Write a protein that binds this ligand. Sequence first.
Ligand SMILES: Nc1ncnc2c1ncn2[C@@H]1O[C@@H]2COP(=O)(O)O[C@H]2[C@H]1O
Length: 166
Amino acid sequence: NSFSGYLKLTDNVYIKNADIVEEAKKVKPTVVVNAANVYLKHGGGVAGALNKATNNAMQVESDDYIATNGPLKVGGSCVLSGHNLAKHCLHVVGPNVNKGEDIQLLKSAYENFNQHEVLLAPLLSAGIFGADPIHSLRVCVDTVRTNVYLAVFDKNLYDKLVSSFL
Ligand SMILES: Nc1ncnc2c1ncn2[C@@H]1O[C@@H]2COP(=O)(O)O[C@H]2[C@H]1O
């Protein structure tokens, strides 16, 4: 958990303009959060990036998890190995608002973070799932009470987030 170059937004939320994969490799966090879908198919976005960095080990583990336990619920999570990126990966499913899933479940999604004292995480539902990323940050700030280090790849978004949060 050797986080460096983060801006403290609140007592427990920190933000950095960084690639979450590179942060995971350099920080070796206890927990890295994956922005997952319910069948844990990590084919793009953050999930594809994290999986690629494990050379598909995350995908093979995820497939076995699903075969035994079934798909996650929207707003739900599971803890699996972090492989070379972290001790653990917390796979969290935010709502896909572009497919009509209720934005209220973004709170449920972030509530999963509170089972872990320190997390390296992306903003949830902000990729293909279509939630407004500034709104997602606000739900994060209002919901997560443990210590969360947010990696925002896109500098244009990072600047908007910092400006919106002041
Ligand atoms: N093919 C894909 N393209 C984009 N994101 C994907 C893909 N497969 C899995 N994902 C992940 O699914 C997540 C759904 O929530 P996010 O949009 O926040 O981030 C998304 C990615 O991490």
